[PDB]
Write a protein that binds this ligand. Structure first.
Ligand SMILES: *[C@@H]1O[C@H](CO)[C@@H](O)[C@H](O)[C@H]1NC(C)=O
Ligand SMILES: *[C@@H]1O[C@H](CO)[C@@H](O)[C@H](O)[C@H]1NC(C)=O
Length: 457
């Protein structure tokens, strides 16, 4: 199989990309623990900034943002109790210094505040403090996954919680927050899990003049639950194309309002992840999902990091690295300084090829073999690229022993031979770069099942 690399961006290219499309979401209550108690956080984020030149954008939110109340007179960043360190708190408070800690991050920061408890004055005070403390503030969410609120939540005001109820609530909360802050272009609106029963298409229809308050429209996407866990299905190249397709309408609806779309919270599987979430294959999902989502028109994807020590989809923890970080790293490397990406394949098979442009010139090609592999002879697929200049190209390979490979259990993936230190996220090992001949403007590469290859032109 053979892909031509066009000399300028194809018609099915992505829009002009963000300086750092691969971002990170941190569970609200846990954010200070990530900054204070998890030495890998600093280095894992610095490694990605080292590739792209831009700090990964971050988002601080999740279900616990709708369990949280702002305490203007607390000198604590976050105050809560849990019976078991693996549990998320049922209630918590956060001080101004929570926003101050967010404000120490140099990359774009999105922070999520509470709408479920209907404490509008308290959320307005939190928003004003966020604007004062967070120089790199990007956006503020007013409620997380409002599609999961019910008639028993304060925000529902003793009436059924419907899509229409949410959309009207969001307009009122956008107007109150922005009116109080004399602000516009600030709110990360929707924040919906999937596209039903609430959608960006429905919300945008209702926003009217409240769109000037919106910074971006936000979707959450988790392809699987612990119950639908299937690693082959997750990482499948054509399966990813199907999986994201319902969001195309959402992206269209945001961009029609001249507002970017984001996946402001996304990861492989729900409830902190299941048995497939810590695997290399989940990293390969992440890599390909990022590329397809950006071509679809999303600006940024923010990959969720949950309870410290009880999070299967996390890129890192206190003591160990996670296989999925390799997908985030490789994605960041593929996109670094790039203006555009285009799909060279038709997304009907397991095999992907993407041309990556800078200044409307092809600079890299990303190749992906999504075939699932755990035992026996490992299959492979040859990829031929045409329209190349020169005598030679270089490549870096992402591989591991198996689709199931976990860093714990000692089957760390490698990115061009390198790994990341448990407990620090420091880069380890000698980088190996592959060479391939160019003859008649053609080069051929071989990817084993469950591999990716980044070719530099
Ligand atoms: C600001 O917030 C309050 C709720 O605290 C709301 O009643 C009021 O209408 C808001 N003011 C403006 C100007 O939007
Ligand atoms: C993108 O367009 C190219 C032609 O320029 C076509 O070969 C390829 O299949 C297309 N891919 C998709 C996913 O539309």
């Amino acid at each position: 199989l053979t892909f031509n690399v066009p000399s300028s961006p194809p018609s099915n290219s992505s829009a002009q990309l963000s300086d750092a499309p691969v971002g990170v979401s941190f569970e609200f209550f846990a954010f200070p623990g990530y900054w204070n108690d998890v030495p890998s956080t600093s280095t894992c984020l610095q490694n990605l900034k080292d590739l792209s030149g831009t700090w990964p954008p971050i988002r601080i939110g999740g279900t616990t943002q709708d369990r949280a109340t702002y305490d203007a007179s607390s000198s604590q960043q976050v105050t809560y109790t849990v019976a078991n360190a693996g549990d998320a708190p049922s209630t918590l408070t956060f001080g101004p210094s929570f926003m101050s800690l967010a404000g120490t991050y140099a990359g774009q920061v999105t922070i999520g505040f509470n709408r479920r408890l209907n404490n509008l004055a308290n959320t307005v005070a939190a928003a004003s403090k966020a604007v004062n403390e967070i120089n790199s503030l990007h956006a503020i969410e007013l409620g997380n996954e409002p599609n999961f609120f019910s008639g028993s939540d304060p925000i529902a005001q003793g009436s059924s919680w419907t899509a229409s109820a949410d959309y009207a609530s969001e307009v009122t909360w956008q107007d109150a927050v922005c009116g109080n802050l004399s602000a516009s272009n600030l709110i990360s609106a929707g924040v919906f899990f999937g596209t039903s029963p609430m959608s960006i298409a429905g919300l945008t229809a209702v926003e009217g003049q409240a769109n000037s308050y919106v910074r971006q429209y936000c979707s959450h996407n988790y392809p699987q639950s612990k119950s639908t866990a299937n690693l082959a299905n997750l990482m499948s190249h054509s399966g990813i194309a199907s999986q994201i397709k319902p969001f195309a309408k959402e992206v269209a609806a945001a961009l029609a309002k001249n507002k970017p779309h984001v996946f402001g919270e996304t990861n492989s599987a729900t409830q902190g992840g299941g048995g497939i979430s810590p695997t290399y294959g989940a990293g390969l999902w992440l890599l390909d999902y990022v590329m397809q989502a950006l071509i679809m028109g999303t600006e940024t994807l923010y990959f969720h990091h949950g309870t410290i020590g009880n999070c299967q989809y996390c890129w890192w923890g206190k003591y160990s690295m996670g296989s999925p970080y390799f997908g985030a790293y490789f994605a960041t490397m593929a996109l670094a300084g790039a203006n555009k990406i285009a799909p060279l394949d038709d997304q009907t098979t397991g095999y992907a090829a993407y041309a990556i442009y800078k200044d409307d010139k092809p600079i890299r090609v990303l190749l992906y073999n999504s075939d699932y592999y755990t035992s026996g002879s490992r299959p492979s697929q040859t990829f031929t690229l045409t329209g190349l200049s020169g005598s030679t190209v270089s490549a870096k390979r992402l591989t591991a022993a198996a689709s199931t490979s976990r860093v714990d259990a000692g089957q760390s993936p490698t990115v061009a031979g390198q790994t990341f230190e448990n407990g620090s996220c420091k880069i380890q090992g000698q980088s190996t770069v592959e060479s391939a001949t160019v003859s008649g403007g053609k080069a051929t590469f071989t990817l084993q099942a469950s591999e990716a290859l980044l070719v530099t032109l």
